[model samples]
Target: MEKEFEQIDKSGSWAAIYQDIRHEASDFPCRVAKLPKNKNRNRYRDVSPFDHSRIKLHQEDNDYINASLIKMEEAQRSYILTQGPLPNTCGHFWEMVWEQKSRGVVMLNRVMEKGSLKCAQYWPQKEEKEMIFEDTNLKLTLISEDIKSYYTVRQLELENLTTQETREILHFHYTTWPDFGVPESPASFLNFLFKVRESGSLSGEHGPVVVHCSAGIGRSGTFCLADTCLLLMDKRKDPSSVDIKKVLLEMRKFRMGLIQTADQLRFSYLAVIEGAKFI
Candidate 1:
């Protein structure tokens, strides 16, 4: 794997690769910068959802968040990419999860990272069995947890007090990822994605899976991009049936900056390259 990545690196420097991505991305719309309402929902100035791709909450109380529903045609998968929940908007976060009927949340960041709280603890911990969101009248309870070396899988019970309904939400949290970097290796990243797949959440039968990182575009984008690329690769008998660049272009129509940096883009390709062997 290292040899392959190094060989690929020799094909172009990071700067050249980034410019290549920019040229491809330039053909798409990234107008999130101009939308005031979308701007209000972003946690960071650079993380707003693209105007065409932003996920709007139809709730009378909650209007928006820095989340977008990204759809990939080749892979036939949909992911809701959003930023870490601000402390004040925690309720609306769960509300969007519930309203969207998401089967699980693929969290790509730790609650605490780099001397800052990137995301609020929206779900219940082991000791705290239940958490209630007053604004949305929703309650989340911990059903189980399986702690691993690099990730933790949690089964959460989501209940709507007013509607008298309850649902199960799977939380796939990758613990070792850096704030603005790719994973230590592509193997570990593929393992985490397969764990989510074993649950059938990404099978396109249910609602979209909610995926988030600090800004929702960098690591989150890498995850979805790698997943989509691999699935498209698997779906075809011929490798050329899947155009990785075109898939990224399609997803960007719904969200800006799917892959954050050139390094991340390289890792994404490496992951798909490595995963294609086993998948």
Candidate 2:
């Protein structure tokens, strides 16, 4: 793995690896995401979650949601990578988190970026402190918040109005990551990642952590790729023996168009290499 890193670092051919991997990543059927009823549920016209692994929200009707569940068996890691929820689907987003029993929601992009609305204002804010979703019979109350320089952590109370069940959710938002670009540095990115890791929200005992950006394929994919690679390296006797590209390809099997740009892919490699030091 270090050989690949050194080769890319020396030759500056990270784009070659990125392009090669982009070509090798295969596609799957996303018929459900293209259906007339489900079309409005998607944030982007082109980005769609695969039908096979897409999360099912309901048993019968209105089960469509543009979210994919990606599982890396070797690393024993699972993540739900999805686009930012549309205004109409914000209720659906909370429903998915509740049904999945996920404790943490990792958001890598800001709700608004470049003066454009990237994600819906899904969670309750400090001023409002509470929001109710009539469609899903759910309510979210802002319990508390801890703001950092790069990211913000908010404690949310998710209550199912129908059953009167309540659960606490952690909203981990990375605020500074630019659109379709990498973070400031691998060090800061990994620090944010480890902060989420220390929460025990990523443990296997809980449901998969919900991860997202605007399209859910770029920044979200980068986050999962780096985190999973680090976990695999920690499990190996020789950390460098882990194959980064292979791990990414395995992830693409569940969701198409992961690691959206060559720069994002390059950042993934750098983060893994930098994080390997701790492993």
Best by TM-score: 2
Look at candidate 1 and tell me the lDDT of residue 71: 82
Per-residue lDDT of model 2, residues 125-239, tens digit only: 8737688988988999999889999899999999999889999899999988866467657877888899999998899888999999989999999999999999998888887
Model 2 off-target regions past 4 Å? none
After aligning candidate 1 to the native by TM-score, how far in Å is the CA of 13 from where it should be?
Answer: 3.0
Query: lDDT score of model 2?
Result: 0.90
Q: State the lDDT of candidate 1 residue by residue for 112-134, as single tens digits.
A: 99888888888888647688888
TM-score between candidate 1 and the true structure: 0.90
C-alpha lDDT of all candidate models, in order: 0.80, 0.90
Instruction: List the lowest-lDDT window of 10 residues for candidate 2.
Output: 178-187
Q: What's the CA error at residue 36 for candidate 2, in Å?
A: 1.0
Model 1, residue 76: distance off in Å is 1.1
RMSD of 1: 2.6
